[PDB]
Design a protein around this ligand. Structure first.
Ligand SMILES: Nc1ncnc2c1ncn2[C@@H]1O[C@H](COP(=O)(O)OP(=O)(O)OP(=O)(O)O)[C@@H](O)[C@H]1O
Ligand SMILES: Nc1ncnc2c1ncn2[C@@H]1O[C@H](COP(=O)(O)OP(=O)(O)OP(=O)(O)O)[C@@H](O)[C@H]1O
Ligand SMILES: Nc1ncnc2c1ncn2[C@@H]1O[C@H](COP(=O)(O)OP(=O)(O)OP(=O)(O)O)[C@@H](O)[C@H]1O
Ligand SMILES: O=C(O)CCC(=O)C(=O)O
Ligand SMILES: [Cl-]
Ligand SMILES: [Cl-]
Ligand SMILES: [Cl-]
Ligand SMILES: [Cl-]
Ligand SMILES: [Mg+2]
Ligand code: NA
Lengths: 112, 116, 119
């Protein structure tokens, strides 16, 4: 079946708990990027300079389509705080997956 | 589909004006990354902070904005107008489909997820 | 007609080799990002106060090349040939659809925005 990239932008302080909850559920493979974001959360002020772009973490996990709902649930449960700035998750289609070492493709390419 | 990811690679010195332009036009949510790149070969050699980069990767900034598909033309026009200089290396923009958008806090999806 | 983004996550020490190989084959346009990756191995172990702890994220490099669909296989082949080592952690390549490409300087779109200039 099809594969999807789940791209989540979360608070950096939530990375370890989200990563662990994903791993616990069997989603071990992931790529993490340091980014900056702005949104309705607003910038860090001083006083009374603004820092409009604040540190965030991007997690990217390519998974089978059937697993997207569960990945989303895990990220939301573990990344949320109830305050503005908790982030967003984007699901992007992935048409092909290749393992560099072996040139395996498809579901094989995400399996040991 | 309804939503799209605009991935714009621009000059680092254009981040502030492009971000301001976008915010002033009502686009506040964006994610910004530091990257390096090259464009196509040939033509005038790219210069960065005074030096010619004949072969090395050149510092750029990536801005990712997920927006409704109806807003893509506007976003692209705002970025290009405010990012361009007329010299090679001004940038490139890719539009990528986004099938789903979810707000972490509420689990709201779709167009609500990008709003308010 | 269509465009694709080839996104490869490779070992940092293979970036220069992969970049050169791609450029030698005419694929010069690319965007490179430092990232951290978690792989299905390992590894890696640290001890503190009588306890082994594992460190799961390690540095990687992301390369993104937007190309015509007809070139995707060639790009994949070049990356695999030049990024591989035979050990766990050599990386993954993902191909993602791109619906529009725009060159900022000129507003040129599509194939035109990926086309070489005169040497
Ligand atoms: N439309 C978007 N496109 C790209 N990135 C976005 C977008 N919206 C939000 N982001 C990223 O997500 C981060 C959090 O966004 P925001 O501050 O708007 O809070 P939210 O959690 O998205 O919504 P709320 O604050 O209402 O819970 C931003 O800093 C940015 O990195
Ligand atoms: N095909 C591509 N794939 C991925 N990234 C690209 C591609 N082309 C350009 N980029 C990214 O966009 C940045 C800017 O490219 P650049 O402005 O040099 O494009 P160009 O097509 O050569 O146009 P110009 O003639 O205006 O320089 C690059 O440094 C790189 O980060
Ligand atoms: N499902 C995934 N989604 C996103 N990124 C991934 C995924 N799986 C792996 N990666 C990225 O690719 C890198 C390589 O992963 P991993 O070591 O699991 O695969 P491998 O390189 O194929 O190893 P092996 O060849 O031994 O299976 C990781 O560090 C991570 O950056
Ligand atoms: O890398 C630099 O500092 C200058 C660019 C350069 O040496 C080159 O690619 O020609
Ligand atoms: Cl991206
Ligand atoms: Cl020009
Ligand atoms: Cl993407
Ligand atoms: Cl092998
Ligand atoms: Mg160029
Ligand atoms: Na280089």
């Amino acid at each position: 079946g099809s594969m999807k990239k789940v791209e989540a932008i979360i608070r950096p302080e939530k990375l370890e708990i989200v990563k662990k909850a994903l791993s616990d559920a069997g989603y071990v493979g992931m790529t993490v990027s340091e980014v900056k974001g702005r949104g309705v959360q607003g910038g860090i002020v001083e006083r009374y300079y603004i820092v409009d772009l604040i540190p965030k973490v991007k997690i990217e996990l390519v998974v089978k389509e059937e697993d997207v709902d569960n990945v989303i649930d895990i990220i939301c449960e573990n990344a949320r705080t109830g305050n503005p700035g908790d982030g967003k998750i984007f699901v992007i289609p992935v048409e092909r997956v290749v393992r560099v070492r072996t040139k395996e493709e498809g579901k094989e390419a995400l399996l040991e």
